[PDB]
Design a protein around this ligand. Sequence first.
Ligand SMILES: COc1ccc2nc(C)c(O[C@@H]3C[C@H]4C(=O)N[C@]5(C(=O)NS(=O)(=O)C6(C)CC6)C[C@H]5/C=C\CCCCC[C@H](NC(=O)OC5CCC5)C(=O)N4C3)nc2c1
Ligand SMILES: [Zn+2]
Length: 198
Amino acid sequence: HMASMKKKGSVVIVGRINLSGDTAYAQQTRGEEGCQETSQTGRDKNQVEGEVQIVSTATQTFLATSINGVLWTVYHGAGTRTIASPKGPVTQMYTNVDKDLVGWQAPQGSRSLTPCTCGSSDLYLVTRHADVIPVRRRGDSRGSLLSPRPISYLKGSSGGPLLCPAGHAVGIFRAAVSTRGVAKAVDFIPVESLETTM
Ligand SMILES: COc1ccc2nc(C)c(O[C@@H]3C[C@H]4C(=O)N[C@]5(C(=O)NS(=O)(=O)C6(C)CC6)C[C@H]5/C=C\CCCCC[C@H](NC(=O)OC5CCC5)C(=O)N4C3)nc2c1
Ligand SMILES: [Zn+2]
């Protein structure tokens, strides 16, 4: 079926989590129609701002987080896809299925988080709805929610950051641990695992 073989589209930035001020809030920067066309062309002329992007493919939506000049997300969201940019599709510079991790060069205009060196266990998870959820670190890749809630509230937030009290990146949200649909804990990619990948 060589003549008909299709190509998957690019990941597309469709919004961001604004952490600029005192109040965190989600912003949409591209609607579903323009996302569809930008995914096909890989050409995204929109201005990018901030640390946490909301990203989409044709079938999934999740988050992506800039840390040290790399926009990081999960492999279960992005696969091996390019990301759209002003000059066309950009190929991944990191791919690690064993960690559920991918990364591209951070887009012009983004701001990057700094990797945490505090060694603190009082963390904060940022979701696609701009909820800032306290999480106690429980291991290298696990943290417990101080206030559990249904997994529905976390769906679509893979690729988002866990931050320390000082706003540094401690990890990338990967998976939720639940009992009877209630998220009690989170699984995340520690920033050290990104820093060695780099
Ligand atoms: C393909 O190659 C791959 C390589 C490595 C890899 N490695 C993984 C750990 C993995 O896990 C998958 C996807 C995540 C997920 O759903 N990620 C969140 C999310 O939001 N995704 S998302 O909606 O943005 C989406 C799907 C658009 C991208 C953050 C969750 C939110 C809610 C949970 C919903 C029920 C699901 C509860 C699961 N629990 C869990 O597995 O827990 C155990 C891990 C150790 C304990 C869970 O979380 N997953 C199951 N897939 C892969 C795939
Ligand atoms: Zn820190």
